[PDB]
Every structure is written in structure tokens, then in C-alpha cells.
Design a protein around this nucleic acid. Structure first.
Lengths: 136, 80, 83, 122, 78
RNA sequence: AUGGAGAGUUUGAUCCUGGCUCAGGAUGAACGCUGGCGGCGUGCCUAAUACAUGCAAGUCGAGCGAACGUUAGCGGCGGACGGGUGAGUAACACGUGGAUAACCUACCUAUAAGACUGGGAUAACUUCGGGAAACCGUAGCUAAUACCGGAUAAUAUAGUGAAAGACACUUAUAGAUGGAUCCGCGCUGCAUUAGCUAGUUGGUAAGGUAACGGCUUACCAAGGCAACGAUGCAUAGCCGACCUGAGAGGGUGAUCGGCCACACUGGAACUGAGACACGGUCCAGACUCCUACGGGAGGCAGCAGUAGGGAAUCUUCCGCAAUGGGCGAAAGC
RNA sequence: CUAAUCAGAAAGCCACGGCUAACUACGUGCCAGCAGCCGCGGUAAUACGUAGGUGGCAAGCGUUAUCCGGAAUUAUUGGGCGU
């Protein structure tokens, strides 16, 4: 803890990397290179539906979504809830980041969000997987 | 508003008064606080005189009357 | 070339202004070096005319004359016509 | 006289710069062709941007060649290079701009849309 | 869009500067060129340009301190 | 110095830890929801996009050549315009003091030398004309406080221009304007870049910018460097703003910019009361294009709106009335 | 803009236990499935589908992500040496 060589030679900070690096980004075609944006809002347009089986910690069954973002790369999602949207090819409002217990996926759906409304079997949630005009 | 008594020492020289004087000062950095002493180089000139092998002098900030050189003052300590 | 200016931070509820010596080719808002104060031309806020224009009235023989319909404020005074 | 395997300088803004004639369509036995003829070539050198890319087979009408073109009054006219304009298989230019002058033989070849953008028409 | 008069006063400005600067181009082709060559050009052939460059430099564009450098290298050049 | 109590984290366990997810918000912060109304405010932050056009500092004279100051454009203006920003530079571009032994100037205000003598040309009326138009040819022009001899005008210690309505002209001179000739600290990172650029050291030029001077050139010797950042070198505005600390200030400086890089493009003969000029002036380029194909030269980094990219990303509602720039002895824009 | 003035409703709140502050359960028999770090349904989800609300609220519900004291995980104030 000696200060001579401290202006001769400095120190570092910690070492951390931020969250969702292949997110918060809008891929170019005119100038071909991405934008570092951290946008509030964004879209999702669909390529498949997707589902993998081996689930230990829950040990029930539920699928997810394989939705591609701009212009030739693998981007993957998951539908956290009791609502099955047996759909695809949508145009939505993204939710950024991952919910607990799925590795590598960081992209999601807001309730409603211009494509569908949601799993309409919900009426008590009034704020989960599709819930609009709910008597409070 | 007058002109200072900037001083220093000498290092080397070339043909027909490529003269100089050394510049230095007491001061420190804003970050990690040590009394490390520091310098930068200047540009004075003579006929051929204020030059290498001992020219502890003064210098000025005036009209240079010079190429890119800047000083007219020599106010000495001694010679070798 | 010299003209009058004013300051701006946040109030009104009565036509207010200020006294200063800015440039000619510019808007009502201008930079002020020797702040003399402000002016209240709302005929209601009398406690706001604390303008001590000491370097603004020295343009009489330097370069100044009532312009932009501002002679009304100088109409009450009379520190001119020295030539 | 534009025969097979000949490099020409396209005078358009489509996106090409040089093409190589592959065949002079017009009949069985045709060898050469003069101003006011259609030929099939391929892009050998293009520019970053446009609709035509390098390695594409398109049609074009040669305009202003090094060889002369005798008229009916007994007058001739020869340029200092061989150029051509890319068509769209409908007697129409694929681009919208044209550089350099053009001949007055395209008017008889039903090419009024190509003789309406050319700066000069000798 | 008021170029309807100053499309072209740049050009009377041109003419009324250039023809006189050229009539100086003949005023540096006599005296200053021949205050060396021994010619008669040090009397009234220096002094025409007194009132001639005076026809020039009563306006803001013609040389001002360069006027004091063109008159100190022709009249004081003895 | 109006001073620092966060959710849970160890193996199995008290214990010395270990930082994470995480908090609340604050963001030009809004998206589904929900859409009582508003005081006032900001929204091409999607793309400093290609264009439905024009759009913009503008008109006039008891001082001047058409008519009962109308009808000029001389002259003045403008032109570098308001506005648009943070596309482009490690740079005196930026906040402050500052040698001026690096600087001066009409616009703001008083003036002051006087107001003498001059010739006479150019816009319009176009005077006369070819031809898709309009582009161009003949070509006296008629004046102008003017295109304009000459006297001394001031720095020889010997430099010239003034053609005033009425009971408004040109100069010796000025206070001033953006600036700044420039000084200084303002003036970031890349050690996967030290044997140092031939001008590195600085003196010595006919030269010249309101401005000293390797600034091109003027003369000669480099080890000037030298293991200390020579130099290369990547974003390239700064600075009153905002969330904010207890305080050092610490960062982003967008509504808000007072200063500067920047108007299709490379320039540009030009010029200016202030230059290479966002609807100027020419000639090279590739653009939606207008043209008997005279060949036109235009692009809303200035309000709109069009195909749009669009988390949202706005009213072509009106037209000078809140300030007069400019024109004008003036009423007026 | 009192203005006589009728009654011209202030959408709807989240998880719904305990921390981030929340209340209990039929649906549920591991079939769907709860879940801001901690964390839940296999026959009493004091979590879930859904249903009358207490903690915050009425122009406001879950989310969007930027540096701030907090992060004492910069150490200018506030940095280990054998581990």
C-alpha cells in the first residue's frame, strides 16, 4: 500500500461484464454493424417454437420459444407462465433478460404487446401472461 | 503586467546558436500525491553564447523574434 | 454596436425584464458582465426595479441612444444630453 | 465491330463498369454487330451499390463504337471507345442516367427512352 | 434571393478594384523596378503614385499598414 | 463536513470472509393497461434519411433619369442570412486570466476636412435583332451626394477625396464589433507502438497578413534525440444543465446552449463597412429529375408533408401584434 | 369565468405467506404447474387457474435499465502479503 509506484504504476478496478451482451442491439444491413443501444422497447419475429424435455429441478413439463432476431444469428427465448401461445410469426414488445432457470436465453414477451393478448384462462392475475380490463 | 524570470540549465546545441535553457518547477499530480519533480524543454537563443557545457541562466516570455524559438533572457548563475 | 439584454431563471406572473449592454445583432436574451439588476414593467411589482446600471449609462458619450421603444424607462431619468 | 469475347465500357449508373459479350443474338451465323444491336454479356467489374452484381448474365444494346457508321447522305461518325447500355428485355434502360454522347441510329431501332436522357445525340 | 442586385455588385467591385490594381501593376513596373536600374524613375515617376495609390487606399479594402509598407519602400528608399 | 442503519450469501455449524444476484428509484424513460381535464413546457432520439414544390433579410428615397416620388435599380442593402446541430479534428475549436518588446479598423455615438472643381456612364424605357420559349447578338444609352481630373488631405519629420432638403455630403480623428496577432494552464485513451526526425536542435531570407517569426523559401553543423513517452495513435466540442456527495467533487453536458468543426459533392476568377458564400458566381462528379432534348445545375444539417425506419417520434389551423435587421429626410415592411 | 348547479364517479393495485413489505382457500393430484436474490404443486400450493381484498395507492396497475451515497467490491479521503 505504497504510493510512489502508484503514479509510476497504477491499479485496476474489479472485473465484471454487463448483462445480455447479444441484446440491447439492432443489427445493421446498410452499414452491416450492430448498434450499442440499451433500448427500452423492441420487437420479436418468429422462426420456430422449440422445446427441450430434460428438466430436473422442476420435474414438470413446459416448452419455450426459438425466436430469431435480426439477420442470421441464433437468438433464444422462453415463455415463463401457465399460458401456452400455440402461435408463431409474431411482432411483439420484448422483455429483456432471463427469468430464473434457463441458460443462455434472455428475451421475452410483455402482456399483450401487439401480437396477441395472452392466455385468457387468467382473470385473477390481472398482471401476468395476458390480463387486460380486470375488475379490481 | 510584466515578464517572468524563467530559469534553468543547458544540455546541448548545434551550429550558430541553436540555443536553449532547461525548464522545471515544484508541483504534483491531482490523484496520488507525491512530491515527484518534473520538467519540460524550452527555446531561447543568442549570437552563439548561451549554450552547452554550462549555461545556468534565466529566460523570458516576450516577442520571440525567432523561427519557433521564444525567449530573450540569459540572467545567469555562473560558468564552468 | 450595443443593445439592452436581460436574465432568465424561472418566474413571471407580471411582465418582467432586466437592464444590460449586449450586442446589436441578437435577441432580447444576452450575456451580462457587470450585472446592474433587473426591471419590472408590469406596473404592479414595484419592488424589483433595483437596477444600478453604472456601466450601461456610460455609453452616453461612448455609443448609446433610446431604441426599440425603451425610452419610457429612460423618460423618468435624465442623465443624458451632455453634448 | 463487336464480336465474341469483347470488353466494353457500360455508360450507365446501374452498377456495372465493364462487361464481356457472350453471344450476338440476331440470327444463325451472325458474327459481328454495329451501333443499334442487342448482345448478351456478363458483368466482369461492378461497383459497391446498385441492382446489377458481378457474375450476372444480362442483355444490353451497344451504343457508340470505335468503328464508323456510314449514313444515307454519305457522312460518317466514329468515337474513341466502345460503350453500351444495359436494357431490361423491354427496350428500356435498367438505370436512369447516361454518360457520354449517343448515335442517332437508336431512334430507328425503337429506343426513344434511351435518346431522351443522353446529353448529346450525334 | 436579393442577389438580383448582388449577383453582380461583386463584379463591379471586381472591376473597380482590379483595373486600378493593374494600373498599379504599371506603377510597380516603372519606379520600384527602376529605382535600381538608374532610370529617371525617382522623380514624378515615383510621385504619380502618390495621388494614384491615394486614389486607391482611401477605402477599407486597400492596404492600410501594408500602405505604410508600400510608401516606406518607394519614397523613403533613397 | 447539515457525516455512511440495504434482500439473502460456507462446507453440515457459531466463526475471519465472498461478492453476487439484487434493491428503491433517476433516465428527453415508456410499452400492453387505463385512457375526469388542464397550469405551462419540450417530441425525424426511426435515418445530421432520398424528397410534393415554393419556403429565407427585406424593401425604398423634399439628396436622382417613366406617371397623376406610383415605375425603375443606379446607390444601399443583403449575401458570411436568421435557423440546424454535435456527421468532422487530441486540435489555443472550447472557461478564465493575459506580453501586446506580435493588433487594427466605418455599423452603437459625437463628429469632422469642409461642402471647390470636374468629366460622364450604366441598370431600367431596354434602343435595334436571329430564333420552342429564353438563351443570346448590335448597341448611343438618360441620370445618380455616382461610375468619377486635380489642392493640401495623415505618419516629409514629402500622400489624395466632398455633385447638402431646408428654416446632407466626403476626412485629418475617434469611443467600439466580432474578434482576436497571440501568451498561459485550460487541452482524453491505445505500450501487441523509442536506438531519433532529416529539418531534430535553432541562428541566419528577397518576401507578408491590422500580426514577431522555418510559416514556403535563408546559410551552415546535427546526434538535437537518447530507454521519461520522440512520435505515431482511437472516440474528438467545450461550458450555466440534470440525477447527485457529508466532502473531495464525481460522472453523462440531450431540454438550454452565450463560444467554435460543419450547407449535395472537389473546388470557385470573384468578393467584402465583416469570405470562398445553406435558395450566390463557374466548372469537374451521380443523383428523383425539369428541357423542340437552350440542357437545366438542386438535395427542408432551416416549418411542414410524401415511399418509409418506425416503443411512442406532433398541428402543412394563423399571420405580424409582443424586438427592428435592412431599406428609407418620411409615412411603411 | 363562483353559477343557479342536477348528483356531470377516482380506470383499478400487484404479487396474493415470510423478506420486496401479501389473505385464506376449493380447482391440483405431479397432469398443467408457483417463483426480484431466499424461494414452491406428488392428495389440505397460509404462492399456483380463479375468486370478496389487508401494506402502497386513485390519474394511476406489472414491467422497461442509467449512474448515483448505498457497493467499505478504488482505497484523494475508505488498499494483502505466510496463509
Amino acid at each position: 500500500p505504497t504510493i510512489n509506484q502508484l503514479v509510476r504504476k497504477p491499479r485496476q478496478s474489479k472485473i465484471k461484464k454487463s448483462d445480455s451482451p447479444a441484446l440491447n442491439k439492432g443489427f445493421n444491413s446498410k452499414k452491416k454493424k450492430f448498434t450499442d443501444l440499451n433500448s427500452p422497447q423492441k420487437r420479436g419475429v418468429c422462426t420456430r417454437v422449440g422445446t427441450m424435455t430434460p428438466k430436473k429441478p422442476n420435474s414438470a413439463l413446459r416448452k419455450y420459444a426459438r425466436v430469431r432476431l435480426s439477420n442470421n444469428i441464433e437468438i433464444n427465448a422462453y415463455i415463463p407462465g401457465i399460458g401456452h401461445n400455440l402461435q408463431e410469426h409474431s411482432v411483439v414488445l420484448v422483455r429483456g433478460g432471463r427469468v430464473k432457470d434457463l441458460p443462455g436465453v434472455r428475451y421475452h414477451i410483455v402482456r399483450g404487446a401487439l401480437d396477441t393478448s395472452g392466455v385468457d384462462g387468467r382473470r385473477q392475475g390481472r398482471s401476468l401472461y395476458g390480463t387486460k380490463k380486470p375488475k379490481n | 503586467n510584466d515578464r517572468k524570470v524563467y530559469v534553468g540549465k543547458v544540455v546541448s546545441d548545434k551550429m550558430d546558436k541553436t540555443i536553449t535553457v532547461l525548464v522545471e518547477t515544484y508541483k504534483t499530480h491531482k490523484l496520488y500525491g507525491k512530491r515527484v519533480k518534473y520538467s519540460k524543454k524550452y527555446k531561447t537563443h543568442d549570437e552563439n553564447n548561451s549554450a552547452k557545457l554550462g549555461d545556468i541562466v534565466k529566460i523570458q516570455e516576450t516577442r520571440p523574434l525567432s523561427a519557433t524559438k521564444r525567449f530573450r533572457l540569459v540572467e545567469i548563475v555562473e560558468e564552468s | 454596436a450595443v443593445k439592452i439584454r436581460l436574465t432568465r431563471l424561472g418566474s413571471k406572473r407580471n411582465p418582467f425584464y432586466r437592464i444590460v449592454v449586449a450586442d446589436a445583432r441578437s435577441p432580447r436574451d444576452g450575456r451580462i458582465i457587470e450585472q446592474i439588476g433587473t426591471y419590472n414593467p408590469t406596473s404592479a411589482n414595484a419592488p424589483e426595479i433595483k437596477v444600478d446600471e453604472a456601466l450601461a449609462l456610460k455609453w452616453l458619450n461612448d455609443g448609446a441612444k433610446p431604441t426599440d421603444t425603451v425610452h419610457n424607462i429612460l423618460s423618468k431619468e435624465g442623465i443624458m444630453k451632455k453634448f | 465491330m463487336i464480336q465474341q469475347e469483347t470488353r466494353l465500357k457500360v455508360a450507365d449508373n446501374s452498377g456495372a463498369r465493364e462487361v464481356l459479350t457472350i453471344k450476338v443474338l440476331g440470327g444463325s451465323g451472325r458474327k459481328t454487330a454495329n451501333i443499334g444491336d442487342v448482345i448478351v454479356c456478363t458483368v466482369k467489374n461492378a461497383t459497391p451499390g446498385g441492382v446489377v452484381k458481378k457474375g450476372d448474365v444480362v442483355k444490353a444494346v451497344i451504343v457508340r463504337t470505335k468503328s464508323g457508321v456510314r449514313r444515307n447522305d454519305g457522312s460518317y461518325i466514329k468515337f474513341d471507345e466502345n460503350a453500351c447500355v444495359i436494357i431490361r428485355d423491354d427496350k428500356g434502360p435498367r438505370g436512369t442516367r447516361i454518360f457520354g454522347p449517343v448515335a442517332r441510329e437508336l431512334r430507328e431501332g425503337n429506343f426513344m427512352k434511351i435518346v431522351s436522357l443522353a446529353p448529346e445525340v450525334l | 434571393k436579393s442577389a438580383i442586385k448582388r449577383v453582380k455588385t461583386t463584379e463591379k467591385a471586381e472591376a473597380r478594384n482590379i483595373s486600378q490594381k493593374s494600373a498599379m501593376r504599371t506603377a510597380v513596373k516603372n519606379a520600384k523596378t527602376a529605382v535600381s536600374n538608374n532610370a529617371d524613375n525617382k522623380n514624378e515617376l515615383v510621385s504619380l503614385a502618390v495621388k494614384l495609390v491615394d486614389k486607391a487606399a482611401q477605402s477599407n479594402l486597400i492596404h492600410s499598414n501594408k500602405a505604410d509598407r508600400i510608401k516606406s519602400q518607394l519614397m523613403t528608399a533613397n
